[PDB]
Amino acid sequence: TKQYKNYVNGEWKLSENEIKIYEPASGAELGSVPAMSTEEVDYVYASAKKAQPAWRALSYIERAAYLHKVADILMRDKEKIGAILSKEVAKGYKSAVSEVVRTAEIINYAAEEGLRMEGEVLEGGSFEAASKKKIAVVRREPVGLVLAISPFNYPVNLAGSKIAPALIAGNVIAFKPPTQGSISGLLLAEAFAEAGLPAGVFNTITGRGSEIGDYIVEHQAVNFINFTGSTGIGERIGKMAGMRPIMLALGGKDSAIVLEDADLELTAKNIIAGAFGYSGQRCTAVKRVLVMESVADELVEKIREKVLALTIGNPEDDADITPLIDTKSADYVEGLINDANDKGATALTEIKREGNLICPILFDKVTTDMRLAWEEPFGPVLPIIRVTSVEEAIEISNKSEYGLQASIFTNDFPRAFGIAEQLEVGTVHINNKTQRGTDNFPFLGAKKSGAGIQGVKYSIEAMTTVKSVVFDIK
Amino acid sequence: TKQYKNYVNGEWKLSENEIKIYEPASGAELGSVPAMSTEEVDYVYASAKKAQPAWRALSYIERAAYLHKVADILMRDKEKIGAILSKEVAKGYKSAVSEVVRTAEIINYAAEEGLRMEGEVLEGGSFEAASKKKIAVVRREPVGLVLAISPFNYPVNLAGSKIAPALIAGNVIAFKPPTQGSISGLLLAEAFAEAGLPAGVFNTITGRGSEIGDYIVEHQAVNFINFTGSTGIGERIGKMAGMRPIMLALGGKDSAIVLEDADLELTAKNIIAGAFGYSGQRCTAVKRVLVMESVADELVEKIREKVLALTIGNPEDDADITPLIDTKSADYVEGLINDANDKGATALTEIKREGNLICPILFDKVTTDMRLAWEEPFGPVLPIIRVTSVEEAIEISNKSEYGLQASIFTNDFPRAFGIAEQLEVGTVHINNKTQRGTDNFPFLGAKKSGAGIQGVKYSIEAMTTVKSVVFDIK
Amino acid sequence: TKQYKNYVNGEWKLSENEIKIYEPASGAELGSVPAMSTEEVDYVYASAKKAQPAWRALSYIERAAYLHKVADILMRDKEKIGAILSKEVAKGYKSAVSEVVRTAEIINYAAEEGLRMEGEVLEGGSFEAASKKKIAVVRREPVGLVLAISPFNYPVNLAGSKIAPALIAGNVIAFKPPTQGSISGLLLAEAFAEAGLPAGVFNTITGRGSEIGDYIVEHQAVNFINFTGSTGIGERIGKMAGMRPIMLALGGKDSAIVLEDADLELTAKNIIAGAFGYSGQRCTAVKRVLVMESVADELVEKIREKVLALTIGNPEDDADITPLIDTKSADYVEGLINDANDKGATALTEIKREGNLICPILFDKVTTDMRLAWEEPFGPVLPIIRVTSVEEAIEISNKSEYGLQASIFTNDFPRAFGIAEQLEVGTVHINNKTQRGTDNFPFLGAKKSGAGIQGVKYSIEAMTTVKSVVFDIK
Amino acid sequence: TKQYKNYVNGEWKLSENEIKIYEPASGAELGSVPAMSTEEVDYVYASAKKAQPAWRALSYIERAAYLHKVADILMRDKEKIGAILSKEVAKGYKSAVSEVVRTAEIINYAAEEGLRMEGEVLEGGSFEAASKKKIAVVRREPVGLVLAISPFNYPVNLAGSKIAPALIAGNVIAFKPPTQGSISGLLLAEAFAEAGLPAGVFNTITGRGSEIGDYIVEHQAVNFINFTGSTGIGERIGKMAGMRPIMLALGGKDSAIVLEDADLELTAKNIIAGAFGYSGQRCTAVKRVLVMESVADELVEKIREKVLALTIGNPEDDADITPLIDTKSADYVEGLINDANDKGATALTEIKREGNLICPILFDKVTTDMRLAWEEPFGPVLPIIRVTSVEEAIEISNKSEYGLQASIFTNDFPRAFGIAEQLEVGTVHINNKTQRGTDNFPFLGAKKSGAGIQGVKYSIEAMTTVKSVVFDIK
Ligand SMILES: NC(=O)c1ccc[n+]([C@@H]2O[C@H](COP(=O)([O-])OP(=O)(O)OC[C@H]3O[C@@H](n4cnc5c(N)ncnc54)[C@H](OP(=O)(O)O)[C@@H]3O)[C@@H](O)[C@H]2O)c1
Ligand SMILES: NC(=O)c1ccc[n+]([C@@H]2O[C@H](COP(=O)([O-])OP(=O)(O)OC[C@H]3O[C@@H](n4cnc5c(N)ncnc54)[C@H](OP(=O)(O)O)[C@@H]3O)[C@@H](O)[C@H]2O)c1
Ligand SMILES: NC(=O)c1ccc[n+]([C@@H]2O[C@H](COP(=O)([O-])OP(=O)(O)OC[C@H]3O[C@@H](n4cnc5c(N)ncnc54)[C@H](OP(=O)(O)O)[C@@H]3O)[C@@H](O)[C@H]2O)c1
């Protein structure tokens, strides 16, 4: 077993204890990652705080450079990383490589967006005559040490989207990847080491969050917690954060609202691509379709067919639907499938599980009484809820505790815009599937789908504070 | 008993229980405010939530017109409200009227700043050539129900600063003034009532924070908590907030760094005003002078001299130093004073307390051993700490858990900017006492001094989220 | 004859020579305006320049107060001023009052928009590491003396649209209204004089442009020339401006592109309103309908009918169509009508001219060989051109030397956006008549329709410049 | 002879005629450049206009990629190009290399700054309630064909600073380098050619500016003229621009204001570097020192010494002072030296001219009566003017018809700022020599020093317009 080390204060370290990582699809052993001790966690943080001042004293262009190099390295090794990554989280090899390319892109972009952050000069005279000679020179500054924590479905991409924005602004990082993905995370950590950033600027932490999780979050060394993951852990992070700044990208139950005048063929393709992408293990996936009755039968039919075209199989074969992350997860989905069924839902696709590989199932005639109408599966299961009016679609849509994104399919644009304003989500895509898509675009969840606004530009803004220097003109 | 009432969903309501409020200076009864029950709190939030949609559906200019109407009413009644506020929190009459005027100004300014908030249009083609025809139309939206909590030292001003920004953006309000100052808060409600805002858009909650504070804060109807008060309560707010956004303005121990080249007269004049305004009961007060040894003697004598010119007395006489808010505080301050004296600090004034009226006291040669060096007094007690370099002054300054604002008196502006970057504070004033001064300016606190960035423009930004609508161009 | 006086350096001055103004509709004498000498113009500019420094020395808020005051005065006198305006430019009384009200709104809006202009702080370290301590504090400053020249169709509104934005930023104004409209212009001046703006900050000039026009514009005292008029004069001013900044709002031949999926009823209402508003004497009027052959017939009929419901008559009666500004215009318009009629266009209405009152005429099947297809009429004449594709409509549209605004009537917005990108105009309205509408919006013309970007905020940035103060932080 | 070709429509073309360019220092034949006919210019534009649409159709990131490549080419061949450039305009070989590096830097930066241009969404409801559902989606668009004309002192740098911002935004360029510098210009063109930018996107025009000058500018294909050169040709470009947008970077007489409390050694070093850089052949440069009598003798002496340390000679030997660009300029400068001399000026340095090489001369006691006090020499001659008050220094400084930049040397910053507000210039450097310094900073001149605001970000803004799409939400 290859025993990986954590990049800490400019060195690769192991821990007295470790964790063995396996392949969800095969079961093969990929290696082990350290299981840090609070003492070791304390070292990572003590290291970062000590390097922060020097890292911040650098010019924006110097930090941008280190970051571009990192991206250069990731592009160079997009094959090695994708290889492991693909195996570590059972993600299609091609898409796995793509995630690394997406990561490189986000890093380069953040580097360039961040070196152009500008300040403001406010006039006292705008508020009171007596203060006309008083001005405020407001410049942005880092919050200090940022604790980045990534999910299993994008251990690298959702690591960089937090790290790059943090570093360019002058913050130091403590990256805790998901255990089931800790290898991929350490591979990313490799690029940062090779790039040669100063020791302590970028560090990693591994170990089941189920034992050092609260510790790394509650540690007073952290000035900001940027997290993507379950809504459950999200809640707790919010409470442990106290009054400290936080970034939370949690679950979602994105609805696809289909009006009578929609382009059913296009709607169907988008709903297919979004719902089943990566077996439904995507936060922004199309997890529920709210379709008008008059066009339901036809739409459903289109979906069904296109579902059959999906490729069921293993990661190395770039199959649309691959084995779910783990057994627990698959069991969860099955529970939702059984509940939908017993209550009347009609499965138009075959319900079938083999290992942790669940075949894509299309549930029609789903009602708000079924768990599947609400709970986030994170498995290939798409329920279809029929409505008799846009207004109903709005209610059912907002009734959810989730509000990441929503889709609206219709040809009546002005109306879609009106409906978008009413949806309790961050982003509404018109005649397209939901997606974080275009990382410069803002990405945020409403209600229990998140806290804070992501998207390169917004992430930088989020992980920086302001320092205002006021004086009077003579 | 003159019984004041809360403004709830367009009507004035008493509660089965009340709390008698007395003048801190004279001890005379001022009236009573309701001691709301949780049921009543529930009805307030329910009211605000039910009113939010219609309030948001209005145009910005319409919401603006309402705020201007409130501001005009406050200006018209500046003598009325000022007179009572003066008595309720033992604040000079003139500065009390002044507090009201400043409130109308904030209200007016928020109305205009907010009616012209703009959205952005992002290019998908900026990130990937493949999305060149995809654009993101991003517009600001209200977060919902905002809970505003003001402090005793500015029950009206620090209410308007949260309320107007919140309301202009389309949020609805629940205003909880401090108990000692609740009558002033209810007088402010009068202005919103007379202005005619739709029932539910604006509401008040009164009652002992030690008995309904947790409840009004932990309530899930609250989408955002904007609070100004003690760090202790502030911390609890942070945790009770969970993942919900917050605005915290807390304690402060603003240091005034005085270099060898500082204009000692200007420095003493500024330090006297900032340290003793309203008897030191200010968050942005100059609460500790870090001055180079070589100019200490001269500076200290200028302070001592000006301190003795401060008037001591009653609010109606517009005295500089008035009785402290209550007995607990006067005790706490006197204890800080005695601890200094007993530990050896060099007192430049006689230690004197008449009831809750503590005469301005100045302690020179205070050491890091003395409580007065760190604890926020919120009384007219000013410590002087002699340093032998800017490096040390910066260390002492940052040693504090507070980091609201800082003053730097020197003639070397480039150096002042260098020092400013090192000081862990929100704002740094050069050759001027610290101050929230000019409300368009950002107002924030580092470390334990706060969370979030205030100042009209920033408050609106803080209490709004973004709604991103994405679509492809044909 | 009531002798009107120009307002110069805080004084109401007459001129040795006067120009009599007659009511276009009745021919009745309305009064007379001064006929300044080149030297009297020199005194206007000398005063302005002399008062500029002290005007700029004021705080932003103080200048805003003066403007707000002017606005209030105009609201109070809307009827008084409106009545004269109506008589002077043959604009319907009600819409004449509307111009005044709209003017106060712009004045007020510019006031609040202008006091909120902010500065920027640029980091040298964004460009080169060696300059990481160098920062640029950039703040806006006025350009100096601004010459504002308004048009006859909005002598007051297109006056304030330039004046207020210019004054708030700290510039001084020399306002030259149109001779036929000067009385209204001077009435506006009254509102400034009464507002009590410092002498010389605001001034007026009157005289035949065909005599002192080149002078007022060529005078080197003028720092910025903000103009709205004919493309002919507009170009002369362009060359006379030299390298000095300018604002040109010129002619337009806004086209209304009607696709096959357009709501024809809504399409017809908008075409009629935008085409015949003020008898077509609008720069943003609908002046040519490019409609797909298949819906041509149906659309044409809807229009023909709506045109007939238009009231025709005198301004005092608020008639839709009133006498044109002068006999020259009426002659020219008739000439364009006869050319179309003689060349074969299909008139859907009768040709009828009574004095300078031309009845609303509609020509269908207008070909590219007919003058009415390109020349801006500025009369109640509307050409309807049939096309066979969107590509053709786009071609006919851009072939024009004009490019102010355009309208697209369709049920497909994404396509409308793609077409808008192709149209060489400033603003594209979807399912709505073209319009300068909502003055905070940008207003600009491509090709020969204008230079510079108007709209309150943009006007302010146009008539201000930047002052960059660069220094190094120690 | 070494004959260069123009890069037209993606091909290298010669003309029936040509112009031979000789090394300003050795008089050797560097080579020849085409002397295009008007018909050949017509082809360059017809080609550019033809490629424009497809160039714009590309995504922002794609256009940025092309630019980055061009920058890469330049860095690879920096020595190859610096060699030729150094020879073409007789400038130190090292700085000739730096100019190329600076060019690559601006190009890379422009591509990144420009790929992030964002639009705005304006709310109708901000101006009137009736238009609350009306919004304006405002996006930036390129003006079309941009004509770039660079100066002799920076044939490469001041070309890229116009081309890149222009191109990234979607415009096509027609680059007209100065005859004396056309070889370098064409060398740059090679990088663009090797980068593979679509034919017609980037084109070059060579020929005597006195022959084809007015033609290329007046040509109607040009939508924008971005020019850097003499105030003389600038004024003409102004008129010939008509109403089309223009960017003018003309000459300057940057004053260096020295106060009594300045750091004379620091001041002097700065003045030496700024006034004599590139033999003073720079638009931004200390061309006049306005120093308080009090420290004039001391400052003068320091400058005097530092002048003697300056090297004299060939560009190949990186001498500080090189031969002026041509006989004419040297004749002109010498004339200024004589007028100043015959009027009383004291030359503290040997007035010596050998060929077109003038030794650095420092003139003391220069009065406002000497040509040298006002005219831009573009030679190694520094006049010194003794003033007795800041007020005077401000008055003299502003009496200049130039207003590019200024320098204030003092330790009283609040005062420096106050003074900077009064100086009629674009940028004011405190305790630093004037410079375009750090290209992201704004760069502009007042009065006769320019028109438009440069600096990467501002250049892009300048060469783009706006397209506004308005519609009503439903
Ligand atoms: N109730 C629901 O609706 C729902 C929905 C989806 C998932 N889940 C839960 O999520 C898990 C599997 O799904 P998932 O992998 O996407 O989610 P998850 O593992 O819960 O995601 C939480 C992320 O936070 C880290 N973490 C765990 N405990 C932490 C703590 N105390 N403090 C800070 N960080 C901590 C984890 O690291 P490690 O990887 O090292 O543990 C993990 O990367 C299961 O336990 C499942 O029950 C619940
Ligand atoms: N932790 C510290 O560092 C610190 C320092 C100085 C003073 N204090 C405490 O502050 C008080 C006097 O100073 P102060 O008036 O400036 O501060 P404070 O009273 O603590 O200010 C807190 C404000 O929040 C309200 N509040 C109280 N408990 C709350 C809760 N659980 N949830 C939400 N809101 C709550 C209060 O309303 P009511 O007015 O109705 O109570 C008060 O207006 C004393 O009780 C003192 O012990 C704490
Ligand atoms: N309506 C039509 O169909 C039509 C057709 C052809 C020509 N016209 C001509 O257009 C004019 C009426 O239309 P309009 O008012 O919209 O356009 P315009 O009068 O051309 O508008 C130009 C504005 O600039 C002023 N001005 C005149 N000469 C100037 C100069 N040399 N330099 C600077 N400013 C100058 C004018 O003032 P004054 O008011 O003092 O002139 C007027 O306010 C008449 O002159 C008419 O002969 C009209």
Side-chain angles (χ1 to χ4, degrees), chain B residues 354-412:
Chain B
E354 219 91 293
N356 284 338
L357 183 69
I358 288 182
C359 300
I361 184 75
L362 172 68
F363 281 90
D364 187 355
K365 289 167 186 166
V366 171
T367 57
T368 157
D369 171 15
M370 321 184 84
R371 291 175 58 206
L372 185 59
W374 311 103
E375 297 176 47
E376 177 175 45
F378 238 63
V381 186
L382 171 62
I384 310 296
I385 296 174
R386 290 161 183 256
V387 298
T388 65
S389 84
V390 173
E391 285 71 3
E392 178 182 34
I394 289 179
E395 295 179 6
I396 302 291
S397 194
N398 290 344
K399 189 69 173 303
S400 174
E401 264 236 290
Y402 295 110
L404 198 53
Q405 306 211 345
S407 266
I408 302 178
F409 297 80
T410 171
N411 281 304
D412 195 326

Side-chain angles (χ1 to χ4, degrees), chain B residues 306-337:
Chain B
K306 299 171 178 303
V307 160
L308 296 178
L310 294 169
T311 55
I312 291 73
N314 291 160
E316 61 270 37
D317 304 322
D318 285 302
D320 295 323
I321 301 297
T322 50
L324 292 187
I325 193 63
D326 61 44
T327 300
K328 195 178 72 166
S329 307
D331 287 351
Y332 172 69
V333 166
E334 176 172 50
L336 278 168
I337 293 178

Side-chain angles (χ1 to χ4, degrees), chain B residues 57-62 115-116 118-123 125-126 128-129 132 135 137-139 411 413-414 473, chain D residues 57 59-62 115 117-123 125-129 132 135 137 139 411 413-414 473:
Chain B
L58 298 180
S59 63
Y60 283 105
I61 189 157
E62 281 172 288
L115 72 60
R116 43 172 67 68
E118 313 158 307
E120 350 173 58
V121 177
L122 302 178
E123 300 287 333
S126 306
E128 63 169 49
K132 61 156 156 289
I135 62 174
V137 183
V138 188
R139 302 167 61 215
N411 281 304
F413 273 49
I473 298 181
Chain D
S59 63
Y60 280 99
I61 199 288
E62 286 174 308
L115 77 73
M117 293 309 268
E118 314 178 330
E120 14 172 47
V121 189
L122 300 180
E123 301 286 333
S126 292
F127 202 87
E128 76 175 50
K132 64 175 173 181
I135 65 170
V137 180
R139 303 168 67 211
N411 286 305
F413 264 55
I473 294 170

Side-chain angles (χ1 to χ4, degrees), chain A residues 57-62 115 117-123 125-129 132 135 137-139 411 413-414, chain C residues 57-62 115 118-123 125-129 132 135 137-139 411 413-414 473:
Chain A
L58 296 183
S59 71
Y60 286 95
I61 192 175
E62 295 177 298
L115 65 73
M117 298 312 273
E118 289 164 33
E120 341 173 66
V121 190
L122 301 180
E123 303 288 330
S126 295
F127 197 90
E128 81 164 57
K132 65 185 164 197
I135 63 169
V137 181
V138 187
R139 299 168 66 220
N411 284 324
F413 201 87
Chain C
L58 290 181
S59 67
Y60 279 108
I61 187 172
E62 292 169 288
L115 67 64
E118 338 239 287
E120 330 172 66
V121 185
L122 301 158
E123 300 286 351
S126 306
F127 201 96
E128 73 169 45
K132 73 176 173 184
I135 71 174
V137 170
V138 185
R139 302 161 66 216
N411 207 74
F413 274 48
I473 302 167

Side-chain angles (χ1 to χ4, degrees), chain A residues 150 152 176 178-179 207 209 213-214 217 227 230 233 236-237 328:
Chain A
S150 53
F152 83 78
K176 154 76 175 73
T179 282
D214 288 4
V217 174
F227 166 102
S230 63
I233 298 296
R236 295 166 58 184
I237 298 289
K328 277 170 47 194

Side-chain angles (χ1 to χ4, degrees), chain A residues 149-153 176-180 182 207-217 227-233 236-237 240 325-326 328-329 332 375-378 402:
Chain A
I149 299 171
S150 53
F152 83 78
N153 69 319
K176 154 76 175 73
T179 282
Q180 189 52 45
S182 283
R208 307 192 192 70
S210 315
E211 277 153 53
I212 41 74
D214 288 4
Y215 188 82
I216 67 181
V217 174
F227 166 102
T228 303
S230 63
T231 300
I233 298 296
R236 295 166 58 184
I237 298 289
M240 297 182 280
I325 188 61
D326 63 44
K328 277 170 47 194
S329 300
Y332 181 50
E375 296 169 55
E376 183 181 54
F378 239 54
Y402 292 118

Side-chain angles (χ1 to χ4, degrees), chain A residues 38-361:
Chain A
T38 73
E39 283 71 45
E40 282 169 344
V41 164
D42 299 305
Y43 189 66
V44 176
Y45 292 153
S47 300
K49 302 291 290 192
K50 185 184 177 182
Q52 194 282 314
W55 176 245
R56 175 198 164 185
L58 296 183
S59 71
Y60 286 95
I61 192 175
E62 295 177 298
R63 288 197 291 281
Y66 278 109
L67 301 183
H68 285 299
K69 194 174 183 177
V70 167
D72 287 344
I73 305 187
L74 290 172
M75 282 304 288
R76 181 187 73 195
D77 309 351
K78 62 163 179 291
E79 251 67 44
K80 176 180 65 173
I81 313 301
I84 319 302
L85 177 51
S86 178
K87 301 190 296 173
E88 194 172 22
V89 302
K91 171 178 295 183
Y93 181 82
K94 289 181 182 178
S95 63
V97 178
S98 196
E99 181 185 315
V100 185
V101 177
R102 187 150 144 72
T103 302
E105 295 178 353
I106 291 178
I107 298 184
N108 282 133
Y109 199 85
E112 292 299 333
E113 179 72 52
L115 65 73
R116 289 181 177 65
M117 298 312 273
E118 289 164 33
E120 341 173 66
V121 190
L122 301 180
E123 303 288 330
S126 295
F127 197 90
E128 81 164 57
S131 291
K132 65 185 164 197
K133 302 316 299 173
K134 195 186 300 293
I135 63 169
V137 181
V138 187
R139 299 168 66 220
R140 297 197 126 299
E141 300 195 334
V143 294
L145 161 63
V146 180
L147 166 61
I149 299 171
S150 53
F152 83 78
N153 69 319
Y154 289 96
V156 184
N157 187 199
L158 263 32
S161 65
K162 299 177 174 55
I163 296 182
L167 294 188
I168 184 62
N171 300 288
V172 286
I173 281 294
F175 167 41
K176 154 76 175 73
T179 282
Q180 189 52 45
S182 283
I183 292 168
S184 301
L186 291 171
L187 297 181
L188 173 59
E190 223 146 53
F192 281 82
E194 179 175 343
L197 282 54
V201 172
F202 170 89
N203 309 281
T204 70
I205 287 176
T206 51
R208 307 192 192 70
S210 315
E211 277 153 53
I212 41 74
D214 288 4
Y215 188 82
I216 67 181
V217 174
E218 296 174 347
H219 197 303
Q220 294 312 292
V222 178
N223 320 104
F224 189 113
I225 306 120
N226 193 149
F227 166 102
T228 303
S230 63
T231 300
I233 298 296
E235 302 278 18
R236 295 166 58 184
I237 298 289
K239 295 185 179 182
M240 297 182 280
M243 55 189 267
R244 293 175 288 172
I246 65 174
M247 243 308 155
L248 300 192
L250 316 171
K253 185 65 176 182
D254 297 358
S255 59
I257 296 180
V258 175
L259 317 193
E260 285 170 342
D261 60 280
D263 171 353
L264 302 187
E265 183 51 34
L266 169 124
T267 303
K269 183 218 290 297
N270 279 287
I271 290 177
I272 281 292
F276 301 98
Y278 190 24
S279 293
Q281 288 171 159
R282 239 160 47 70
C283 62
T284 61
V286 185
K287 301 201 185 75
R288 54 176 173 160
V289 184
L290 306 179
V291 59
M292 289 293 287
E293 184 56 15
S294 66
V295 298
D297 295 357
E298 181 171 357
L299 173 61
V300 174
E301 187 60 62
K302 289 182 175 296
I303 308 298
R304 184 184 72 63
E305 290 179 62
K306 291 179 178 294
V307 174
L308 298 180
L310 302 176
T311 58
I312 308 174
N314 286 174
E316 58 277 57
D317 299 306
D318 299 306
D320 294 348
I321 288 65
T322 51
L324 298 188
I325 188 61
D326 63 44
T327 314
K328 277 170 47 194
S329 300
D331 295 321
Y332 181 50
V333 188
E334 257 200 290
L336 291 168
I337 288 167
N338 297 326
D339 174 89
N341 243 157
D342 299 7
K343 293 182 187 177
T346 307
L348 304 176
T349 301
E350 178 177 51
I351 299 181
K352 166 190 165 190
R353 175 178 175 184
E354 186 190 305
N356 295 327
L357 178 65
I358 292 70
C359 291
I361 131 74

